[PDB]
From Swiss-Prot:
Zn(2+) 1 binds at D9, D83, H114, H118. GO terms for molecular function: metal ion binding; toxin activity. It comes from Staphylococcus aureus. Its main location: secreted. This is Enterotoxin type C-2. Its cofactor is Zn(2+). GO terms for cellular component: extracellular region. The keyword Signal applies. It comes from the Bacteria. SUPFAM superfamilies: Bacterial enterotoxins (SSF50203), Superantigen toxins, C-terminal domain (SSF54334). Staphylococcal enterotoxin that activates the host immune system by binding as unprocessed molecules to major histocompatibility (MHC) complex class II and T-cell receptor (TCR) molecules. In turn, this ternary complex activates a large number of T-lymphocytes initiating a systemic release of pro-inflammatory cytokines. Also causes the intoxication staphylococcal food poisoning syndrome. Keywords: Disulfide bond, Enterotoxin, Metal-binding, Secreted, Signal, Superantigen, Toxin, Virulence, Zinc.
């Protein structure tokens, strides 16, 4: 339930990070893991579930270990047939069975059950996103999802992908924007947001950032609102 909005001296600034926005960019530009009717094959630590997800493209991996906020959240989805969608990283990765390498891909949350989570028909109310560049609302685009209770992560990954392409949200040196956050407003008024900018330093740690999503936070496509609030780098 309910999160305030970003306090001024609280948001991450790109002029403070110094290690290629390209490493932050790699996670959202045409990037994610997708699985349709998978059940957990096994676990590494109490809180994650390992799936036999093969890189259904240019095979980079065949197993994907996604971490949840704890053992209880894992316990809930283990034995379940789930749809998955999340952004993966290769930087760090689990040391399973010690018997059977090529590609181990990691992620956080991104697990939605297949059972009755799809629409009677197609991509429903393809989720609209409001963009504010320096207060001002300038764009609004929609993102499609075929599930009723979709992860906030999935929408976040599709929102950013769009922005990166037409707004150049993230680029290889740094970013056109100093600050940025994606605000999610649930139909009940519940509100929450994610900082879109990397922490101050040279390196960006992919896994530490992506941990935002381990909570496995879901919403509802039909009713949810989203506003991305940016702030351009001055000059």
């Amino acid at each position: 339930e309910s999160q305030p909005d970003p306090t001024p001296d609280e948001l991450h600034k790109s002029s403070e990070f110094t290690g290629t926005m390209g490493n932050m960019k790699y996670l959202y530009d045409d990037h994610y893991v997708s699985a349709t009717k998978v059940m957990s094959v096994d676990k590494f630590l109490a809180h994650d579930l390992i799936y036999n997800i093969s890189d259904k493209k240019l095979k980079n991996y065949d197993k994907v270990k996604t971490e949840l906020l704890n053992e209880d959240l894992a316990k809930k989805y283990k034995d379940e047939v789930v749809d998955v969608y999340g952004s993966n990283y290769y930087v760090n990765c689990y040391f399973s069975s010690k018997d059977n390498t090529g590609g181990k891909t990691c992620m956080y949350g991104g697990i939605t059950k297949h059972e009755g989570n799809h629409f009677d028909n197609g991509n429903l109310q393809n989720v609209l996103i409001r963009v504010y560049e320096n207060k001002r609302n300038t764009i609004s685009f929609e993102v499609q999802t075929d599930k009723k209770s979709v992860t906030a992560q999935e929408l976040d990954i599709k929102a950013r992908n769009f922005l990166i392409n037409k707004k150049n949200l993230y680029e290889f040196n740094s970013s056109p924007y100093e600050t940025g956050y994606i605000k999610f407003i649930e139909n009940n008024g519940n509100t929450f947001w994610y900082d879109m900018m990397p922490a101050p330093g040279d390196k960006f740690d992919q896994s530490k950032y992506l941990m935002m999503y381990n909570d496995n936070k879901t919403v509802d496509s039909k009713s949810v609102k989203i506003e991305v609030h940016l702030t351009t780098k001055n000059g």
